[PDB]
Design a protein around this ligand. Structure first.
Ligand SMILES: *P(=O)(O)OCC(C)(C)[C@@H](O)C(=O)NCCC(=O)NCCS[C@@H]1CC(=O)N(CCN2C(=O)CCC2=O)C1=O
Lengths: 301, 77
């Protein structure tokens, strides 16, 4: 039994994906619908973007991810039982699964991108989300207790693997956190701005509900979707609406998604899109055979 | 100057370097294809193969910037 997985966003540039987007017929179809929905040339604004994670980059990733899933289905004759999306990917699965029309998912993605930028212009300034590895829970607790001791606010924002976690907190503690991680053999990966996945962001959650998600029409998916907050198999439009909202304030629990999938009979997984993380981490590897449906793969003969 | 045990290992994590292209000492590993999780698995293979534990300054990104700094840093253990 097979599942369709949609990954989180990661580091890349237009050079990595540009030939794919302009050459693959799935993506061309989807770009046409995206342009007609936004009122501009997505490829053109993505092409000239001055960032790693602009609005335009985010919508392009949506499109690439969905087209690669449609691409893997036809190319490799996959017949998925169930699907799942991590972090950014929640938006990808919504569209793949049929919970939203592609056009609403483009609107959605675009709206939330503006909305995150407004929000974090003034709110929780200096807060950052740190990723790290080679950190068993035992060691992480010691660090957190040392943080509690100094009265410094924090929140675990993601559980990736037994020894792989994301922690959100003020950047004042970053250098110390990094140094202290390394002291016990843990390796810092990245320090992400804006931050993501914390109870203290219920304010952002409300604003995405009112300004962006509420006007949209959700449909039950054509296959069930495993929530990345806790492994819940979802089956209605309203459960997919909720996951996209809870995402701002509930931590991502990737070992729970792997659990359900295994429990629902899944032997194999196709990861749709460019992928620095969820298709490669041990949590996914040890459980399943992985097909990596990346722009590189879709440009072989 | 490193050996073939080191380099065969290291090349299993540089997808944009071809077998017929030399591994320059000062070449930047990120541009040659090493990324976060690659680095993680690469640490792994080095710690088994060489029976060491990386730590403190050896876990900064700088260690992994080039094969030269990585070989230097590894020799010391
Ligand atoms: P190494 O540097 O090669 O690898 C680092 C790492 C493995 C961590 C790699 O995956 C990485 O760099 N991650 C990218 C982090 C980053 O910089 N992201 C910037 C923000 S963008 C993306 C946009 C977005 O909206 N989200 C999630 C927000 N979100 C939800 O998760 C649910 C609802 C919602 O709005 C992103 O991740």
């Amino acid at each position: 039994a097979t599942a369709m997985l949609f990954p989180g966003m990661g580091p890349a540039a237009f050079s990595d994906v540009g030939r794919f987007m302009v050459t693959n017929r799935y993506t061309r179809e989807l770009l046409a619908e995206a342009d007609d929905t936004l009122g501009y040339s997505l490829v053109d604004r993505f092409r000239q973007a001055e960032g790693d994670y602009s609005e335009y980059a985010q919508i392009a990733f949506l499109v690439n991810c969905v087209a690669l899933a449609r691409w893997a289905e036809q190319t490799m004759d996959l017949t998925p039982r169930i699907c799942a999306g991590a972090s950014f990917g929640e938006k990808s699965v919504a569209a793949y699964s049929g919970a939203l029309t592609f056009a609403d998912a483009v609107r959605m993605t675009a709206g939330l991108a503006r909305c995150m930028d407004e929000y974090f212009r003034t709110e929780h300034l200096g807060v950052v989300t740190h990723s790290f590895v080679r950190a068993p829970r035992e060691r992480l607790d010691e660090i957190l207790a040392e943080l509690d001791e100094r009265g410094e606010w924090h929140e675990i924002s993601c559980h990736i693997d037994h020894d792989f976690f994301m922690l959100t907190l003020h950047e004042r503690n970053s250098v110390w956190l990094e140094g202290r991680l390394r002291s016990v053999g843990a390796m810092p990966l990245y320090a992400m701005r804006p931050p993501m996945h914390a109870a203290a962001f219920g304010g952002l959650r409300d604003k995405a509900e009112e300004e962006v998600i509420a006007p949209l029409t959700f449909h039950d998916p054509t296959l069930p979707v495993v929530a990345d907050q806790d492994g819940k198999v979802l089956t209605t439009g309203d459960e997919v609406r909720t996951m996209l909202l809870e995402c701002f304030v509930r931590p991502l629990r990737w070992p729970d998604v792997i659990s359900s999938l295994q429990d629902q009979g899944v032997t194999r997984v196709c990861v749709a899109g460019p992928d620095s993380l969820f298709g490669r981490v041990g949590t996914t590897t040890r459980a399943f055979e992985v097909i990596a449906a990346t722009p590189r793969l879709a440009l072989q003969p | 100057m490193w050996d073939a045990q080191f380099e065969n290992l290291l090349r299993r994590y540089l997808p944009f370097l071809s077998a017929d292209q030399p591994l320059e000492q000062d070449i930047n590993l990120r541009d040659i294809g090493l990324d976060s999780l690659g680095t993680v698995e690469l640490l792994s293979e080095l710690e088994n193969t060489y029976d060491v534990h990386f730590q403190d300054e050896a876990l900064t990104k700088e260690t992994f910037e080039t094969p030269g700094v990585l070989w230097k840093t590894l020799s010391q253990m």
